[PDB]
Amino acid sequence: PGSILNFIIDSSSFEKGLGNIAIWSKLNDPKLTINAYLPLFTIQELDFQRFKRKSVVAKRALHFIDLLQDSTSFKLHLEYPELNEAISWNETVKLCQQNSHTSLSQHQISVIPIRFKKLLKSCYYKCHYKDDKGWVLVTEDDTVRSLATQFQIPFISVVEADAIINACIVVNEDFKNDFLAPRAKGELWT
Numbered sequence: 001p002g003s004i005l006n007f008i009i010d011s012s013s014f015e016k017g018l019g020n021i022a023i024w025s026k027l028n029d030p031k032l033t034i035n036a037y038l039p040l041f042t043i044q045e046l047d048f049q050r051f052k053r054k055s056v057v058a059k060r061a062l063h064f065i066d067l068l069q070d071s072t073s074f075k076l077h078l079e080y081p082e083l084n085e086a087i088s089w090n091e092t093v094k095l096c097q098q099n100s101h102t103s104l105s106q107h108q109i110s111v112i113p114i115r116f117k118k119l120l121k122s123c124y125y126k127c128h129y130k131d132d133k134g135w136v137l138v139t140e141d142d143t144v145r146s147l148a149t150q151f152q153i154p155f156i157s158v159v160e161a162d163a164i165i166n167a168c169i170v171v172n173e174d175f176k177n178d179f180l181a182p183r184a185k186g187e188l189w190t
Contacts, residue, residue: 003168004033006133007161008126010119011045012140014061017158019181022064024165027073032168035075037135038065039122040084041115048115057182079122087121087129095128095151104150116147123153140184158184 014021024034043065049058068076093109112120126135137148137155148155156164156172162184163170172188 002031002033004035004131005161005164005168006035006037006126006135008037008039008123008135008137009042010137010139010141010144011042011049011058012144013138013158013184014042014046014065015049015055015057016140016182017184018057018061018064019183020158020162022181024161025068025071025074025076027071027165027169029073029169032073032165033075034073034165035077035132037077037079037122037126039079039119040081041119041122043078044118045115056178060181083125084118084121087125089117089121091129092117092121092124092151095124095153100150100152102150112147116144119144120147120151120153123148123151127153157186159186160188163188 009021021036024036027034043062046058046062046065049055050062065076065078070076096104096109123135123137126132127137135154137144137153138158138161139145139148139155140158145155147153160172163172170188170190172186
């Protein structure tokens with residue numbers, strides 16, 4: 001029948017799960033397609049981690065993303081930087097207010113850091129804004145996970161995305177150490 005996974009990949013998923021993503025990028029399955037969407041947030045936050053926090057994994061992640069060419073299954077898509085600017089914040093905020101029974105105040109919305117607002121707009125754009133359906137944010141950051149729940153953005157972790165991909169090929173409701181790509185490390189139920 002042919003399965004198709006639509007993932008929005010966070011900055012922290014690259015930092016903690018670069019090894020997992022590099023393994024997905026080489027998948028050659030005709031009955032599996034992974035569309036990896038990298039919002040402006042992902043590149044900007046990896047750049048911040050690299051230059052401001054001096055992260056060696058953020059640099060490795062940026063070099064990998066820069067070289068990465070599409071596979072039979074793995075399709076990379078980087079969000080055009082100006083596209084994020086055209087997404088409405090007022091429309092993005094409706095997801096938090098309207099259908100969310102547990103909501104945030106008008107002030108709690110305004111204090112959300114600029115970078116997370118950009119990530120939320122990309123998530124609203126792919127998940128709620130109206131083949132290219134079932135967009136799920138792949139994240140390893142808890143402050144991102146709380147905001148995704150508030151704004152009704154479906155999300156999964158790298159180990160969860162791994163077991164989903166693994167099934168498609170599940171239900172969940174020291175020089176040598178530094179050389180290997182970081183691998184994500186919870187437990188899934190079947």
